[PDB]
Amino acid sequence: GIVEQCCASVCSLYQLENYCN
Amino acid sequence: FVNQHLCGSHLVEALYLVCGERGFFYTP
Numbered sequence A: 001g002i003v004e005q006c007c008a009s010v011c012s013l014y015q016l017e018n019y020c021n
Numbered sequence B: 001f002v003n004q005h006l007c008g009s010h011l012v013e014a015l016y017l018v019c020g021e022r023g024f025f026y027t028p
């Protein structure tokens, strides 16, 4: 999930944007 | 994990900012 990718390591905004609608 | 709880709080503010008009669903 997003908590596993982005809380174990620091996501970028391009990455975060994957989880948008 | 309290650290994840804290992290998630920041994640949703980030989603809010990046997703904009699109919006988003948060599903831990």
Ligand SMILES: Cc1cccc(O)c1
Residues within 6 Å of the ligand: A006, A007, A009, A010, A011, A012, B007, B010, B011, B014
């Ligand atoms: C913007 C943001 C907040 C928390 C974790 C991350 O990987 C990224």
Ligand SMILES: [Cl-]
Residues within 6 Å of the ligand: B006, B007
């Ligand atoms: Cl924090």
Ligand SMILES: [Zn+2]
Residues within 6 Å of the ligand: B006, B010
């Ligand atoms: Zn904090």
